[PDB]
Amino acid sequence: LVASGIPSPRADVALQLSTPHGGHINRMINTSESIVELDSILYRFRKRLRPANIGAAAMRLEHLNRLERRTPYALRVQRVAAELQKYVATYTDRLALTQAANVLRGLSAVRHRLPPELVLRLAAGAVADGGAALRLAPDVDVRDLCFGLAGQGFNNTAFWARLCAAVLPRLRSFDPNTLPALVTALQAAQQLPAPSTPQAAVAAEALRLLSRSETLAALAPARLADAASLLAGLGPALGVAVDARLVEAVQTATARALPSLSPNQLPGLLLAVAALRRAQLPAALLATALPHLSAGAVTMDLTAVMRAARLLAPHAAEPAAADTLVRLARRTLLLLPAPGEGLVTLSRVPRGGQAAGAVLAAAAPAGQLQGRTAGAVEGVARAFAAAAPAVAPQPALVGELAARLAAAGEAAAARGLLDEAQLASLGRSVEVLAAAGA
């Protein structure tokens, strides 16, 4: 304890940092618990950084940006991303597959696109052999490499052919939850055509691995949501079929993995199983996932309340569905700016780590109007026009909801984020809601 107001040294951090071993900069990076703390660490050692430190810094920037709920397009994140991009340009042929996968995933998940010749160098360096880089690297490195190269553009379809030819013999030795990231990375580029063939072959063998029992009950939660979405989206096109063994296994494991999903992940999984049964929402599964949907609606972003409102669109007369839908109505009322905040004040927003961007999500929730929520207010408008008799008991609530939907639509159309088809559908949904509101 230095000077009575300066934090006393923590126990485990001092025990980890005091080593005879090397690795001090990477340990300082890994104990940085916020963003300009990491930037001050990168400032202190900027004449001392090596490729391992650049990979660790990119991964830690990714984790700290997701750890708060602030946007990746913030200036702090983009400055750290460009500073790491300088060292990536310096060491562009020295980076091994661990470090190249680290910098690619870290700079794609903060949505900072590298120059495409640098991405070309960084992928050709991964395949400048007889595929020997992809046979000495573990499954997580291949997953991070595929996720990073699915971003940064780079739908080269010749690089992906040799990557999929290198990873196909090794794929059944992979841990069973890195497979959905591989299939998602193949789908995210312009691979898997007819909406070349080793890519579809490794996607088919990955979905054959994911479809089986005794592993689908052994995936981690929130990996089964993406696996169920990928199966429901790509089953009849290439791989497994309608069969009730898979749907029974998905429902059984979904009933067990309910509490371990964050509220932004539940409606994706339930729409995934709804799409699975169309290749619906069966009995006594909605009655145990819907208390979770009501308890997760207090902290739930606007595209997630879209997915939950579309989920609760085809039935509204049930009282549990009705008050769940009015809870989503109050949530959409809360996080969408008034046409005329008062929850917390903007002067006291934390610059710290844990959920500081969530406090910035309140305290004038305007300014979170990116393009995703710009189309998503139209989607929520359609989903609430579908669910008439659940919210229609509350007249002033649905009137103020229509007012805020129209105000956000006008504002984001003024910002250039909508077009005339979305504006017309938004107008139809807001006039339905406003006619129901009086």
Binding site: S18, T19, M28, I41
Partner: protein, 133 residues
């Protein structure tokens, strides 16, 4: 010398555990809820909450009781005792991260020596090396 003896955190000031509320000679102010009292009658907070100074009937006359009232957003996130301890722990951890962000790595927070682990007992964290049988 100087012997500064006064009240440090006034009423309505947000407090965190360990913060000295007032330093006095003799119990001019008496401890209340979520409040500890030291050897020299120092009043220190044992909970996250705003300080409240209220006057109550006393054995000699007009006792002033210093207390810490927990936040209304706490006791809503919180059997109850375990839940309050978990809520307080997260607030204390968040305070440290915010303070470290505000002091931008310009103060010597942790040892980070080139030495073998700073002497560790079975419990660990001893700045005292002790030989082991």
């Amino acid at each position: 010398x100087x012997x500064x003896x006064x009240m440090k955190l006034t009423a309505g000031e947000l407090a965190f555990p360990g913060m000295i509320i007032l330093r006095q000679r003799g119990t001019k102010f008496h401890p209340g809820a979520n409040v500890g009292i030291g050897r020299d009658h120092t009043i220190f907070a044992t909970g996250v909450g705003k300080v409240r100074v209220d006057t109550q009937p006393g054995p000699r006359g007009e006792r002033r009781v210093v207390s810490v009232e927990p936040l209304p957003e706490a006791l809503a996130a919180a059997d109850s005792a375990l839940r309050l301890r978990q809520v307080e722990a997260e607030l204390v951890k968040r305070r440290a991260e915010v303070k470290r962000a505000m002091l931008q790595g310009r103060t010597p927070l942790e040892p980070a020596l080139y030495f073998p682990l700073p002497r560790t007992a079975d419990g660990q964290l001893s700045w005292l090396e002790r030989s082991v049988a």
